[PDB]
Amino acid sequence: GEWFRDNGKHALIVYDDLSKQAVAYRQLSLLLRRPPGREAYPGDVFYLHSRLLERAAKLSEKEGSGSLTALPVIETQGGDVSAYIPTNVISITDGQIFLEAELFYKGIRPAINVGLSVSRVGSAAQVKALKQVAGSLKLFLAQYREVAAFAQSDLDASTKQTLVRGERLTQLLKQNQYSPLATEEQVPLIYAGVNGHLDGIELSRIGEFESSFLSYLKSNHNELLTEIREKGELSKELLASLKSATESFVAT
């Protein structure tokens, strides 16, 4: 992967997974009779993973501007992040995407637990267009989750609106496997959600809606899709155009 990085190019590396590597390292170490410690890992297992993960980097202009990017994988046991290796790796990287059985069965796939996931780089690693419509998205799902347990009657106009919007954004964010979306397909879906244009549609149809809205946007408003893709930003005219294309699709 580093050949790419080192020659002004960019490569993604997925280590699937570092739990199992840790296990083989441990097997070597015990067999060579090196001193064991917590969980019988050698006392240099952390050095094993940080040697490895600090090699992912964005290089300076002086050195080609190439980059390596790492998605290490870690298996937890009963969601125990406090376990030795998970702890090492969670402290070495720049954030977690944290996935959960329960969210999965609920139907929330990717079963990403937002309140537990982070990108320590964050918004600087994000297409400006998506940062614009989804800056709030960060906020709401956070608010959704606090007020969450109220889903079970006699509620405020404040706390039910929170409920209605959240339920929908949560549904928007579902996705099928092997079908990643373009950035110009994401922002209009997320502009739609974030800015209230979904609160009327019943939760069963937010699926068929996303499908139908994108195709429609392709048929009629290929103009703004292109500009989103090409400029990567959203000017003021563009939000106003997006707003127009959205409101026109909802009413129909």
Residues that bind another protein (CB under 8 A): 20, 23-24, 26-27, 29-31, 33-40, 42-44, 46-47, 77-80, 82-83, 87, 101-102, 105-107, 123, 149-156
Q: Which amino acid is at 76?
A: T
Please check whether residue 121 is in contact with residue 95, taking contact to mean a CB–CB distance below 8 angstroms.
yes
CA dihedral sign, ordered 137, 138, 140, 141? positive
The active-site residue, picked from 109, 120, 168, 205, is: 120
Return the H-helix or E-strand segment holding 57. strand 57-58
Please, what is the minimum distance in Å from the beta carbon of residue 30 to another protein?
4
Please check whether residue 72 is in contact with residue 53, taking contact to mean a CB–CB distance below 8 angstroms.
yes
Q: Which is nearer to another protein, 20 or 229 (CB)?
A: 20
Calpha distance 201→41 (Å, rounded): 53
Q: Which is nearer to another protein, 2 or 199 (CB)?
A: 199
Q: Which is nearer to another protein, 6 or 17 (CB)?
A: 17
Peptide bond preceding 199: is omega within 30 degrees of 0, i.e. cis?
no
Query: Which tokens sit at 2?
Result: 């580093």
Angle at 114 between CA 109 and CA 115, to 5 degrees: 145
Residue 29's alpha-carbon distances to 51, 75, 194, in angstroms, are: 17, 21, 52
Q: Three-class SS of residue 44?
A: coil
Please, what is the minimum distance in Å from the beta carbon of residue 152 to another protein?
6
Q: Which is nearer to another protein, 83 or 217 (CB)?
A: 83
Residue 135's alpha-carbon distances to 43, 132, 158, in angstroms, are: 42, 6, 21
Please, what is the minimum distance in Å from the beta carbon of residue 224 to another protein?
32
Please, what is the minimum distance in Å from the beta carbon of residue 185 to another protein?
21
Please, what is the minimum distance in Å from the beta carbon of residue 146 to another protein?
11
Find how far residue 162's CA is from the centre of its chain.
22
Q: Which is nearer to another protein, 38 or 205 (CB)?
A: 38
Q: Is 5 a catalytic residue?
A: no
- Catalytic amino acids? 120
